[PDB]
Design a protein around this ligand. Structure first.
Ligand SMILES: Nc1ncnc2c1ncn2[C@@H]1O[C@H](COP(=O)(O)OP(=O)(O)OP(=O)(O)O)[C@@H](O)[C@H]1O
Ligand SMILES: Nc1ncnc2c1ncn2[C@@H]1O[C@H](COP(=O)(O)OP(=O)(O)OP(=O)(O)O)[C@@H](O)[C@H]1O
Ligand SMILES: Nc1ncnc2c1ncn2[C@@H]1O[C@H](COP(=O)(O)OP(=O)(O)O)[C@@H](O)[C@H]1O
Ligand SMILES: [Mg+2]
Ligand SMILES: [Mg+2]
Ligand SMILES: [Mg+2]
Lengths: 55, 472, 485, 120, 485, 128
């Protein structure tokens, strides 16, 4: 009887874990954008600064 | 015969002046232009060649016409120094802006001056009690030392200083110099009210502090020099008077920010992030002048702005090295409701040594860090699984940790209009014993809420009892 | 061919023009071309001059004639602008005939000095409960409205305007608060429909509209905020109170970074120029409370910033936050859960609120802001399902009731007198016993109870604006008695 | 399309596929001209260009023009300038999911994703 | 006329375009009329680019310029010992002129491939965590990379202090002179550092070169190179030297500044193309010389400052590739109580056991490998599952070895005191002791040997190895102490 | 190959690989001092591949019923299909045969990720 109570709790434990971990993914995935865009803009700045070189 | 010239170009806060005479004014010199509104002051930056020079406007350049006549001053922008500046609001240029008559000072020194010799350097390891728990316990400030208050926007850098002035400037005994660099013009006015009410600055009587402002509303040239103006005044009381002085600066970042706006027009090749190539030097010459020498001691509380909450930014990242104490505020802590939002981990000082704050103080502090650290290292686990998955030993450290964090908060008398709770000043002696008692596990029964925005450790048990009657 | 007041176009492109001549021109002076397009001498060089184009470069041909205005760019300012919709230049765009201006002011004014100022102390009822309780706005304050797309950023500024009607129709002047909305980078329809709503609520009579549509050239959007500012500065100097709202400043910087990049300027963070700070800086500073000697006038500003993915750590956003006197973040998550306005108490802040808040609210709402801040920390920490103690659970029950009480529908402004009662009950806990789904109906039913019975209390808090030690008791016995029934 | 709006005053529909390549087009043009690249690489003038097309599509007193233009999300990211700027004009969105046509539902319009700014 | 002189065409930001000088060499020193000296880096027909060592407010257009005829060199020899000089080698401590024996250039060719010896000589750092895991060797360059406020300088500083054990001696081939190179630091700090050296009578065998932030960029850039020549001196005269750069990260920033200002195209993040060549031709200058050359040697401890723990950065990677290993220091380990916070996982020594002491080599063989297993087991016991005898046994010992490695600053420990401690660790005599006991255990155990079993300490010291007999006595001395108390 | 296409036949051309081509072209463009775009690629880089792939098609019955198939090869850097060059190519083609090293190691050879691999024409060109 106390085995049927563990599975029941463990079924709830991993349910919220998937919800938190899952929702955590929708948060880091946003940080992956701003960080992707940052690298694209930064690499672009050196390219422009190397060409804007005059006297 | 006054040396005279004509304007050849006017781009933003950068005006190019040309002189017919074969005598050219050196660099860092001042210039003046006649206008209906008043007089516009210029500052030499570099000799472009061909008897042409490049200068930086000190005010709006609207109306300037090409070829207009320009008069030379003959010396770098100077500002009145001496006890006569006290209780007076001086402008970046060095003229009264409080409408109370001209500052009849004895001497007038230039804002530009070379940093103290290596042999003139004097080191000290004396503690300075502020009353702030998260500080006097973790990263205590030193007398005549350099203080830094990093943090993003709206984290608590000024409000933090205001409290320091409400607790040190009063019981100080020396002189003070407040200089608002690129800050809300409104905060300056309200600051003036406070100095008058508190009596620090008495119009009819005497005063204990001088007010120099180069607010953000002012153009870049000013936001760049204002810091130098305020500093010149304070280095006077240091060498000439040889008396303890408190130098309050806010915000120091504007100094480099204002210089990065013009670096482009000056014809400099932008370094990474857009900042001017000579960031390290300029910032260098400034910090090296703000220090204690064998003639006098000066305690400086400089606030630093953190762009996009990025500590890796070249601006703030080059500021840490010029500080004996660093108190960083993370917006991730202020949002929790914890104030001041001091981050115990990142916060460092040079006084955090057992050969100064005592052996016990060293041990108690360390224990607090380890505990807070262990909570952070399991933070990932907490959001995913929870505390149910945490071990018995780990679960006990979390709660204890969370208790220590909340306890770090402290009601600020200056921020009473925000918290609605009367200020709480805690002594260093009691703070140490307090945490030490929490580490020993003598308050694991008391609820966490009782640690939130609490002053003295006695107030914790008091507040815990009040919560018993409120429970229904 | 007078190379002293007129010159010839050497080249044109990228929205910039290099004219040859104009030896007697002032820095940043308005100009006009043969086509009739207005420009501005943004920079002066030996042998040539840089002019920005306020219109399409199509109309600017190479080799045309260029005359100067002789005056810096300025816009008509006065009371005659009320009820009238103009653009960045100050010309009418609604078609109700020319504007009746009392005078002309520079487009670029310097902020008042430090001496001619006073701390704000005049409350500015926005109509929103959650607002005028946690982060109230006062005459001369600069409250930021940051939030993501469709979060209710303007919904907080718009309701404020409609709530001012309660004093604009009065006899007294110091009570009235003029409004000046600024639309930049927005759609034609978006503004047109926005105006219509004002007319339906009869709020356009005391409001001025300045337009800088996206179709319009970038510079227009750049000068729109500055000029619109001078329109309201007038009321300030005359001892009157004005209220200007920028919607939105974030787009401006984008429009300015355009001219910034076109003129070849070293890129900064996110491709914004280093002087982007001085942009919003110079604009906001011109909003404060003057001293009594000046006229006791003020100018409250409500800048708006649009973030991405709830990122307040961005560049533009932080730059504004380091200028404004508090922010009212609007998280999208709370906006979808129904919690509207989606004010996030966690990031919301007011640097000068209590100072300009009604004492009746300061008493009933004590430590409410900090409590909510700690609320989300324990609430989001118990959402796992784990069992907690009585201490955390007790704070978790009271937090939920307050959160729902902060909620409010749009176009439903409530008097301060009506707000005071609601807050009192929340802190005390009388609501705790109340069911969660009955919190909404309870508010509408509780207000009727006072009007039908204890009306005297409402009239006292109205005039006095403070709760004495006696009225405090009469109020408690009046709410407790209602909670029981 | 504007012709039948101002002349015949009809409710003409303008279909654009895809609004994304329109921004890309501008980006290549402004690139060759020498103009300095904005954030993410897009053109600085991007903001103004978008308006020189969206604003022209409106309901006048004579007729009206409804725009039905497809949208492409670069790297499944809505923070990007191109999409960000486009959505600022969009009033409604008709999404077409594979899982909708998979259930034998035609059109494959998804009720959950399809939203409008005139749903009040 | 202009062959030996020239007139200044422009000047600013520490740069001066002088006209003339058609017989000046590359990188040659020059002197202006003002008194300020300068350095020529860009040779062009039109003009010559020169960098200023001082402020530029003194140089003006049309000023006279003279040449030195010699490449920028610095005084060298024993005289400098105990003195504090600047880039150029001038005294800044105020204790008389620098009595030098010879003068060597700033830029010197790295030692030959032929005149070299494999590193076999240890460098007692006094740090157990270091001398046991990542040993230093006379002739190598061990990096000290880490974020700010971690303990980079600490590692270096303690090393110099530890050398007092042999520098006070009579034997030369055993001593080890130290050269600290402060670059980018404030004068305040340098002053306190030199104060600390004196408090330990470590200034007598120490030379300090100051290039504080306030000084001109060309000083900070030249500081390391000149400083190296100072140390090379001992290397050539058959003596041993130990130079510490702190830090090259600032030097590159400085050298970046001259490039940008001389209008030299930037590479990545504005750093000059040859930024690698900046540290490569610096570190290679330190190495072990052949017996024919003098058996002389120069050891180098370069210091780098990472941001946010990002070792993938531009400058750091450039140096990691050159240095014979690195002592990674993590902030996170510091709080956890690991001090010094040396991450063994990432810290390695390429010379390896060759450099380590033979005695200490025996007692700790797979110790580094064992600490690797510990972190392997420590991460796996995170699951919250019970552990068997094996995984818990190693977990017990691995946890205590990490606690034994913790050593206080300013407290260098001899070799005769490190061996015993590590011995009792790797074997398993601490397993049966509580963790908070390891602390006092160290001090108590040492005092035990210094009183009773002192003969053994004397054999380990002289012999430097462990014989069949010495192990026997050492074995019994350990067990006997465990039984005590 | 167009020869075959024009004359009424069938020709298969495989570009292996377009990635290298762009690099070459980038080199010329930079040396000639033309404006640098994302990742140092000039604005006409897309016009390059679009003006290449569109050359292959299926001529009608009147034109000769001839046809030219194209199989362009693109090399990604760690699965990054979001890169500049790949995004251009993937946008022009009519389907991808995405391949992953991981699937290769398991044994699945050729490692054709069924999940990603797609074809817009599909059954239209498959034996019944
Ligand atoms: N308190 C509220 N209750 C219910 N709905 C609301 C509330 N506030 C706003 N809304 C709805 O949200 C919609 C979005 O309009 P709103 O102007 O508030 O968004 P926004 O973020 O200001 O957009 P923008 O910044 O582009 O102007 C409105 O049409 C309105 O119906
Ligand atoms: N072994 C140690 N044990 C305990 N604390 C230490 C140890 N070493 C250093 N610290 C502490 O760390 C702080 C900074 O140390 P250190 O000077 O080594 O850092 P750093 O790498 O030099 O940083 P920076 O380069 O900014 O000076 C000091 O306050 C010191 O007390
Ligand atoms: N000790 C404190 N307690 C509570 N709130 C604080 C404290 N210090 C600062 N704050 C918060 O900061 C806000 C004011 O911001 P401020 O400190 O001026 O930020 P900045 O550092 O950008 O000037 C106040 O609304 C207040 O709530
Ligand atoms: Mg501040
Ligand atoms: Mg809005
Ligand atoms: Mg250091």
């Amino acid at each position: 009887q106390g085995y049927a109570a563990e599975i029941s709790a463990r079924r709830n434990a991993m349910d919220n874990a998937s919800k938190n971990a899952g929702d955590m993914i929708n948060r880091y995935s946003i940080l992956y954008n701003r960080t992707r865009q940052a690298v694209i803009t930064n690499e672009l700045v050196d390219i422009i600064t190397g060409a804007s070189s005059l006297g | 015969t006054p040396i005279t010239g004509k304007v050849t170009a006017v781009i933003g806060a950068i005006v190019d002046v040309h002189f017919e005479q074969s005598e050219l004014p050196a660099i860092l010199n001042a210039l003046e232009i006649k206008t209906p509104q008043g007089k516009l002051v210029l500052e030499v930056a570099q000799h472009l060649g061909e008897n042409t020079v490049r200068t930086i406007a000190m005010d709006g350049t609207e109306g300037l016409v090409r070829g207009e006549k320009v008069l030379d001053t003959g010396g770098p922008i100077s500002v009145p120094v001496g006890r006569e500046t006290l209780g007076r609001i001086i402008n970046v240029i060095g003229e009264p802006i409080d409408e109370r008559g001209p500052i009849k000072s004895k001497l007038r020194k230039p804002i530009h001056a070379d940093p103290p010799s290596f042999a003139e350097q004097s080191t000290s390891a004396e503690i300075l009690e502020t009353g702030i728990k998260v500080v006097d316990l973790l990263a205590p400030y030193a007398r005549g030392g350099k203080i830094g208050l990093f943090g993003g926007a709206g984290v608590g850098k000024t409000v933090f200083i205001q409290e320091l002035i409400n607790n040190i400037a009063k019981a100080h005994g020396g002189f003070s110099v407040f200089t608002g660099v690129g800050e809300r013009t409104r905060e300056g006015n309200d600051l003036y009210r406070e100095m008058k009410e508190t009596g620090v600055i008495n119009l009819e009587g005497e005063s204990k502090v001088a007010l120099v402002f180069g607010q953000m509303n002012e153009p870049p040239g000013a936001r760049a020099r204002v810091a130098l103006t305020g500093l010149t005044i304070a280095e006077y009381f240091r060498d000439e008077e040889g008396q303890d002085v408190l130098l309050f600066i806010d915000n120091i970042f504007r100094f480099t920010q204002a210089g990065s706006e013009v670096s482009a027009l000056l014809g400099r090749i932008p370094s990474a992030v857009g900042y001017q190539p000579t960031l390290a030097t300029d910032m260098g010459l400034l910090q090296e002048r703000i220090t204690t020498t064998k003639k006098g001691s000066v305690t400086s509380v400089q606030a630093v702005y953190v762009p996009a909450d990025d500590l890796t930014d070249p601006a703030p990242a080059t500021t840490f090295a010029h500080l004996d104490a660093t108190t960083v505020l993370s917006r991730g802590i202020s949002e929790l409701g914890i104030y001041p939002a001091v981050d115990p981990l990142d916060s460092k000082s040079r006084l955090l040594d057992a050969a100064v704050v005592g052996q016990e103080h060293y041990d108690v502090a360390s224990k607090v860090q380890e505990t807070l650290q262990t909570y952070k290292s399991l933070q990932d686990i907490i959001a995913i699984l929870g505390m149910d998955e945490l071990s018995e030993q780990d679960k006990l450290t979390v709660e204890r940790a969370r208790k220590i964090q909340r306890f770090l908060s402290q009601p600020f008398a200056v921020a009473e209009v925000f918290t609605g709770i009367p200020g709480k000043l805690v002594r260093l002696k009691d703070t140490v014993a307090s945490f030490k008692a929490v580490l020993e596990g003598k308050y694991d029964n008391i609820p966490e809420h009782a640690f939130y925005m609490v002053g003295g450790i006695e107030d914790v048990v008091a507040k815990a009892e009040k919560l018993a009657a409120e429970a229904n | 061919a007078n190379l002293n007041e007129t010159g010839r176009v050497l080249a044109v492109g990228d929205g910039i023009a290099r004219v040859f001549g104009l030896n007697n021109i002032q820095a940043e002076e308005l100009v006009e071309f043969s086509s009739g397009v207005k420009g501005m001498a943004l920079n002066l060089e030996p042998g040539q001059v840089g002019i920005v184009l306020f219109g399409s470069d199509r109309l600017v041909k190479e080799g045309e004639l260029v005359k100067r205005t002789g005056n810096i760019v300025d816009v008509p300012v006065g009371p005659g602008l009320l009820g009238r919709v103009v653009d960045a230049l100050g010309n009418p765009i609604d078609g109700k005939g020319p504007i009746d201006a009392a005078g002309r002011s520079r487009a670029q004014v310097k902020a008042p000095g430090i001496l001619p100022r006073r701390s704000v102390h005049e409350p500015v009822q926005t109509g929103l409960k959650a607002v005028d309780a946690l982060v109230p706005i006062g005459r001369g304050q600069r409250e930021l409205i940051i939030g993501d797309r469709q979060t209710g950023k303007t919904a907080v500024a718009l309701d404020t305007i409609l709530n001012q009607k309660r004093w604009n129709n009065g006899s007294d002047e110091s009570k009235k608060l003029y409004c000046v909305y600024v639309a930049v980078g927005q759609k034609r329809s978006t503004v047109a429909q926005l105006v219509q709503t004002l007319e339906q609520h009869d709020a356009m009579k005391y409001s001025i509209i300045v337009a800088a549509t996206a179709s319009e050239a970038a510079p227009l959007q750049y000068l729109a905020p500055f000029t619109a500012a001078s329109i309201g500065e007038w009321f300030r100097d005359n001892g009157k109170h004005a209220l200007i709202v920028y919607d939105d400043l974030s787009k401006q910087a984008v429009a300015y970074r355009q001219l910034s990049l076109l003129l070849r300027r070293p890129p900064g963070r996110e491709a914004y120029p280093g002087d982007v700070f001085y942009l919003h800086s110079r604009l906001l500073e011109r909003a404060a409370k003057l001293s009594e000697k000046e006229g006791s006038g003020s100018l409250t500003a409500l800048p708006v910033i649009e973030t991405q993915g709830g990122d307040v750590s961005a560049y533009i956003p932080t730059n504004v936050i380091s200028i404004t006197d508090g922010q009212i973040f609007l998280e999208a998550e709370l906006f979808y859960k129904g919690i509207r306005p989606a004010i996030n108490v966690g990031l919301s802040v007011s640097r000068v609120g209590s100072a300009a808040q009604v004492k009746a609210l300061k008493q009933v709402a004590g430590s409410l802001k900090l409590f909510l801040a700690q609320y989300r920390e324990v609430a989001a920490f118990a959402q796992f399902g784990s069992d907690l103690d009585a201490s955390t659970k007790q704070t978790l029950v009271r937090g939920e009731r307050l959160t729902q009480l902060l909620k409010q529908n749009q176009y439903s402004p409530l008097a301060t007198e009506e707000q005071v009662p609601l807050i009192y009950a929340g802190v005390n806990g009388h609501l705790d016993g109340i069911e969660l789904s009955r919190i909404g109906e309870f508010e509408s039913s509780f207000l009727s109870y006072l009007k039908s019975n204890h009306n005297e209390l409402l009239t006292e808090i109205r005039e006095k604006g403070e709760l004495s030690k006696e009225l405090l008791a009469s109020l408690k016995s009046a709410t407790e008695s209602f909670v029981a029934t």
